[PDB]
Amino acid sequence: ATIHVDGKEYEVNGADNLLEACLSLGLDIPYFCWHPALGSVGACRQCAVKQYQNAEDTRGRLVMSCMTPASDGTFISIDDEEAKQFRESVVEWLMTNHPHDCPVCEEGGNCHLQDMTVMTGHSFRRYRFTKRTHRNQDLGPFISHEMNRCIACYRCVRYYKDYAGGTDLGVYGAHDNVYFGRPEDGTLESEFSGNLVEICPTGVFTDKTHSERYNRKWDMQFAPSICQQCSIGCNISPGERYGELRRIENRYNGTVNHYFLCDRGRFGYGYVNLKDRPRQPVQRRGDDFITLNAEQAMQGAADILRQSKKVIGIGSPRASVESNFALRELVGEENFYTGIAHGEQERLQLALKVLREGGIYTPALREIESYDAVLVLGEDVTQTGARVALAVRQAVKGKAREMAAAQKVADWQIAAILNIGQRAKHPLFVTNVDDTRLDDIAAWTYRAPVEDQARLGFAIAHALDNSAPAVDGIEPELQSKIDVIVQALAGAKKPLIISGTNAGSLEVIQAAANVAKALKGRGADVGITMIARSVNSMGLGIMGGGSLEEALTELETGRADAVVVLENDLHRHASATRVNAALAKAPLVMVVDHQRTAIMENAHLVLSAASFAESDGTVINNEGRAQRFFQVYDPAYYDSKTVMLESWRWLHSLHSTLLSREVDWTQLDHVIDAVVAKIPELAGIKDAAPDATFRIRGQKLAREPHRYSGRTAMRANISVHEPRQPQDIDTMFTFSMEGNNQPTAHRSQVPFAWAPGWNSPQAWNKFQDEVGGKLRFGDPGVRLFETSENGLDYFTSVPARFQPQDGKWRIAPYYHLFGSDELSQRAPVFQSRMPQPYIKLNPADAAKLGVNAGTRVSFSYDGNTVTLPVEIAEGLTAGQVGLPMGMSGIAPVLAGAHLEDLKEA
C-alpha cells in the first residue's frame, strides 16, 4: 500500500495499521498500549496523528495510528501542531498522578514512559493538585510491584491473560482507581510472568532478582548469549556489573523467542553469582588442597595423564559443542563417553534420527504458532520446554484468528478477534501421566502411563494410515476419543506433533514418529518437535559417544586409570553410589567444572571452568539450530587471582601440553574449524556467527552502552592505576563501549537494544526490518540439518498395556519449571519458588497402603531408603508413584524405573 506521511510517499503493507507501518519506516510516533505481539486496543490514546482523505485537505481528523489501517491513499501528519499538542496533553494527563519516583525506580533509564515524556517534549507541570496513590501487593520472589507508577495502559493484563493464558492477573477498580494485579497476595503462578517487567512500560512490575543488586542500563555490560536452562535455546542478553551477572534481558530473535522468555530462563541465572564456584585450578595432595595457576595445572595434569595407560572422557549435555569436542579430541574417539545414561542416549538418538532422517520438517519456535492441530505425546511441555507451550497457546488461538480474518477483520484488531472467536479454538490433545498446565486450552487430556500414551499414539497412527502397525486391546470409549483425535488431525492443514525424551520412554517417540509419518502420507503439512532435556543435548547426540554406564564399567574394571569429567555432576544420569565407587577406585579424576558439584571430593584435580556468562561457545537447541553464545565479562578484571577459562581452552591447552609439552591457549575460531574439519554433521556451526575478524566499518561491536560510567573509579579500591580493558580475541565483540551498536549495522548478533530517544525494550523496533517481524539482516543461528528427501519406516514395536505389578511401583516423572534443571535449582532465588519434594500417589494406592495426604513414606532405590511426604494425585494412574525429577536426590534417570519397599515410615 501507498501512504503519505508529512508529504513524503511511503510503500507500506496494507494489512498493518498505521503505527507499525510508520515505526517500521523509522518514523517516531509515541505509543504505550500497543505491542507488536499483543495487538491494538486503542487505550492510551498516545499514538494520535492527523489524517486527511485527500491530498488537498486542511482540517483533517485526529486518529489513532494503532487503530487505523495503512490503506492506500491515506495522508497522515505526525508532526502537525494539533497532533503534537494532543500527544503532549496525553503525556501530561499521565503525568498528573505519576509519583516523583524516578531516582528510586528500577525502570529509570530503561523506562518507556520516560522516553515518551521526553519525545513529546513535555517538561513543564501546570497540575497543582494531589496525586492518587495505591497500595502494593506481594507477587512472589520474582516480580516486585509498585502500583503508583501505572499509567493504565492494560499491556500487563492483555499479555498475561490473552497471550500467556494466566488466570491470577486482572484489572480491578473504577474510573481512575484502576488496579492491576492479583485479587489477593501470592505468587504469580504463570510460567511466563517474568515478561511483565518488559511488557510494562513503567516501573510497576520490576525484576526483584535484579532489584536486589540493582544497576542502571547504561552501567550494564551486555552480551548476546543463549539460555542454558533447557533445550529450547532462547536468545538472551545477560548484563553484568562489578563482576557479577546482574540481569537477563530478552534478546530479540524473530525466529526463536521473539519477545518472551520463561521464568526459569529469566530468574534461574543466580548460579553464576554463587560464591562456592571454583575460581582457580585446585589440586588435592592427600588432605591438602593447593591452588595452582594455569601453567602449573597444565604441566601437572599432562604429567599424570602421560603417566597413565588409558584416559577416558565423560562429557555433558550442559557443556558447549567446542568443550565436548575438545574433550573428545583430548581423550580420543573411542575413549569419549557422553555423560547421559544409556536410556537417555537411546531416546536422544531416536529423537535426532526422527528429526534429521524422518522426512518431516521440524518447525522453528515462531513457526509453531501457525500450526492448526497440536498433539503432545508424553511431553510435559510447560515444565520442560515452556516457551513451546506458549507458542502452542498461540497456535490454539489461531482458530479465532482465522475466523475473524474470514469476516474482513484486520489482524491487529485483537479485541475484535477475541470477540468473534469467543471460545472456539484449534484442537489440542495432550497426553501425560497427570494433568498439565495446557489443560485449560487442550481439546483433550490423556492421563495414563507412558506405555498407554505410546499405545494411544500407535492407535492414532494406525487409524490415520492402515499400513501403520495396529494395537489390539483398546477400550471403546478410548476408541471414540482416538477417532475424535484422528478426525481432528486429519482435517487439519498444518498438524503439529510434539514429543521428547523427558517422557522416559522410547515408544512414545516411536508413536509420535509414526503419527507424523501417517500424517505426511496423507499429504499434510505435518511438523514434528522433539523437546530434549539440556541446552546442548542435541549437539552431544550428534557428536555421540558411549553412555555413562560404559565409562563407569571402564573405570570399575580398571581399564581406565584416568577420567576427565567435563561439567557433569554424574549423579543426575547414574546412581550416586556406583559413581562414587567408580571415581574413588580410579587413581586420577580430573573435573572441569564451574559449579561446586559433589564429585569434587574424589577429584584429584579440579579445573575452574567458565559458565555461559564467562565463556564463548556454540549450543544446539532442540530443533537443530546451532547458536553461538558470547562471553559477557572477563572474570579476572576485578578479581586478579581468578584463573577461570573456557572449558575448550582448558582441554585444548591440556592436549597441547600432553603432546608437545607446551601450553597453548587457542582461539575460538580454531576450535570451531577443528569441529567442522573433524565432524561433518556439525559443519553448520561455522556459520552460526562470524569470526573474530568481523568488523562493522572497521570497528568491533560494543558490549556496553556509550554512557558506561565509573571507568576510572570501578577498580580504584584495588589500584588507582586503571588497567587496560580486557581484550576479546575469541569474538568480534569488545569489552568496552569503543565499538558499534547501531540499529542499522550489518550484523545479526545484537548485544542489547538502544536507540536515541528509545531507552526501553521498545528500542528493538529500530533493530528489525519490520516491527514484530524478523531481525534486520537476518536472525542469528543457522539450522544444522535440512529435511530429508525420504523418511523412516513405521516402528512396529508396539508396547504392551501397563499392568500394575504388586510390590513394584513404576516411577512417573513430574517435571517442574523451577526445580528440574541442574543449574537453575542452585540459584538462591529459586529456593522460595521450588515446590517441596512430594511423592504423588493414587487415592486407591494410598488407601491400600494406609497413607493419607501429608504423612511421610520411605522407599529404597539402590540402597537409599529416602523418605518423602505424600501428595494425593487423582489423575495419576494406579500402580505408579509420582516423583519430582531433578530435585535433591531424585535424578531424572529415575523416570520409568521401579520402586521396591514403599512403606509408611
Binding site: 490514546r45 498516545q46 499509567i151 481512575d176
Partner: protein
C-alpha cells in the same frame, strides 16, 4: 450543551438544536434558574462524569478529574490564572474522536457551553495568583516571563 433564553424559541429537532451548538439528546430538558451558580452546577456535572468513567482510555480517565479539581478550586474561590484556559484545552482535547467512546465529549459539552455563555462566573472564582512550586532554600528559581 447549555443554551440560553434566546434559544428557547427553537424547535426540538436534531438538526435544529444541532445547528445552534447543542444536541437534542433525549429531549428531556432541564432548566437552570438565576439562583443556581453555574460553576457549582458544572462542578457537579463533571464530578458525575469523572466518577462514572470506565477507566479504559487516558483523556477521560485522567483529564475529567483535572477539570473536577479546577472547578472545585473555582467554587471555593481558590482559582489560579490559566485554569479557564486549561478547561478550554480540556474541552478541545476531549472532543469526538479523541477518546475511545463518546462518554467524554458529552462530559465536556456542558463545560465549554458554560464557559462560552457564562464566562464571568468562572472568572470570578480566580482570586489567588498562580503557584505550582514552593521555595527550595539554596536554589534560585527560574523566573519565566
Amino acid at each position: 450543551d447549555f443554551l440560553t433564553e434566546a434559544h428557547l424559541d427553537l424547535p426540538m429537532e436534531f438538526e435544529s438544536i444541532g445547528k445552534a451548538g447543542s444536541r437534542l439528546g433525549t429531549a428531556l430538558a432541564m432548566a437552570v434558574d438565576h439562583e443556581i451558580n453555574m460553576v457549582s452546577l458544572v462542578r457537579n456535572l463533571e464530578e458525575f462524569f469523572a466518577r462514572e468513567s470506565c477507566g479504559w482510555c487516558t483523556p477521560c480517565r485522567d483529564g475529567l478529574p483535572w477539570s473536577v479539581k479546577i472547578l472545585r478550586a473555582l467554587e471555593r474561590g481558590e482559582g489560579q490564572p490559566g485554569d479557564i484556559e486549561t478547561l478550554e484545552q480540556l474541552c478541545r482535547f476531549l472532543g469526538p474522536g479523541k477518546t475511545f467512546c463518546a462518554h467524554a465529549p458529552g462530559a465536556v459539552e456542558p463545560l465549554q457551553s458554560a464557559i462560552k455563555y457564562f464566562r464571568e462566573e468562572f472568572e470570578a472564582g480566580i482570586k489567588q495568583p498562580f503557584s505550582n512550586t514552593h521555595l527550595i532554600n539554596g536554589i534560585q528559581p527560574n523566573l519565566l516571563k
